[PDB]
Amino acid sequence: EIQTPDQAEAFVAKVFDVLDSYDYTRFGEVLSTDLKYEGGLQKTSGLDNFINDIKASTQRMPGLQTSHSRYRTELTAEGTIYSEGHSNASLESNPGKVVTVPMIGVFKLDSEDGKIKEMRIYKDRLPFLALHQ
Amino acid sequence: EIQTPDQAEAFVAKVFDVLDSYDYTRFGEVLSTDLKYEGGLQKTSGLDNFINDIKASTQRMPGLQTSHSRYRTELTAEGTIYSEGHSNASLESNPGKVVTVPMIGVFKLDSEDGKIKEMRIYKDRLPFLALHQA
Numbered sequence: 398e399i400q401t402p403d404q405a406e407a408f409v410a411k412v413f414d415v416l417d418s419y420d421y422t423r424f425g426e427v428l429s430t431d432l433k434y435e436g437g438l439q440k441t442s443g444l445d446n447f448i449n450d451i452k453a454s455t456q457r458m459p460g461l462q463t464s465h466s467r468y469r470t471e472l473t474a475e476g477t478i479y480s481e482g483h484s485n486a487s488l489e490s491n492p493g494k495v496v497t498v499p500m501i502g503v504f505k506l507d508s509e510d511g512k513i514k515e516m517r518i519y520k521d522r523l524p525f526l527a528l529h530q
Numbered sequence: 531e532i533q534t535p536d537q538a539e540a541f542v543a544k545v546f547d548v549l550d551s552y553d554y555t556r557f558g559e560v561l562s563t564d565l566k567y568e569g570g571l572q573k574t575s576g577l578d579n580f581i582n583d584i585k586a587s588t589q590r591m592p593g594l595q596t597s598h599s600r601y602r603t604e605l606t607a608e609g610t611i612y613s614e615g616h617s618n619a620s621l622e623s624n625p626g627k628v629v630t631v632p633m634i635g636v637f638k639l640d641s642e643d644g645k646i647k648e649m650r651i652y653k654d655r656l657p658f659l660a661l662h663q664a
């Protein structure tokens with residue numbers, strides 16, 4: 398399935414395309430039922446727990462929009478995907494105010510179906526405070 | 531010379547041993563003079579610029595103390611070191627208030643002398659605001 402860095406990067410792109418849509422009914426297309434997720438101090442086990450965690454943060458930030466880009470992905474001999482890129486966010490209240498930070502995603506895939514079973518996203522959230530005027 | 535993940539991880543531990551001492555005269559033992567560093571929106575080119583960036587940031591937080599641990603390191607076929615661990619910080623004024631966040635370091639080494647020529651550190655700094663409060 399995923400054999401090259403380019404295919405890994407395209408998969409990560411597809412994953413964030415789903416995630417940034419906030420269409421939770423599709424998250425299971427790409428995330429395993431027992432997903433282990435860490436995002437700084439946010440940590441969840443299982444797909445429903447992942448979805449509930451995002452929903453909570455999203456109610457906290459109404460009007461939130463996010464997007465992601467990638468520029469450097471490796472696919473290692475252990476099967477790990479390391480993907481460096483950037484994370485963008487804006488608030489619908491002032492959508493022209495965009496905050497962008499570097500990010501890296503660490504992914505391990507399910508050997509059976511190729512879904513993400515471990516996802517650890519690293520980025521500095523402090524700059525997103527600038528979304529509040 | 532680094533050929534295994536365990537040696538990669540042991541080297542990263544020593545690197546942060548030097549960095550967390552804030553003894554800037556030693557940074558060149560492990561960092562190349564043309565080091566390319568990115569730490570969130572912090573970005574520097576050259577060792578002197580890296581050092582000045584840290585010095586500026588430390589002036590903002592007197593009494594800062596830091597340490598690091600590691601748990602999962604890979605050394606790839608491209609020579610890249612990816613090292614996941616944690617970043618701890620406290621203030622000397624209140625040393626028992628510790629804030630710890632996950633972190634990962636991305637490193638490329640100088641083929642000549644084995645020093646770090648690229649270092650990109652990723653972590654959420656927002657929790658460290660709790661070091662001002664109480």
Ligand SMILES: CC(C)C1=C(C(=O)O)[C@](C)(C[C@H]2[C@H]([C@@H](C)C=O)CC[C@H]2C)C=C1
Pocket residue numbers: 416417436439451454455461463484485486518522525
């Ligand atoms: C302030 C930032 C921009 C923020 C996110 C975060 O930093 O946790 C969340 C809580 C979740 C992100 C997800 C995680 C897995 C990020 O990669 C994917 C996209 C978005 C739903 C949404 C906005």
Ligand SMILES: CC(C)C1=C(C(=O)O)[C@](C)(C[C@H]2[C@H]([C@@H](C)C=O)CC[C@H]2C)C=C1
Pocket residue numbers: 549550569572584587588594596617618619651655658
């Ligand atoms: C608030 C946080 C904890 C903080 C750091 C940071 O987040 O930039 C700096 C500015 C620099 C770090 C260095 C960079 C390369 C971090 O990895 C190494 C250790 C410390 C000297 C010091 C404390």
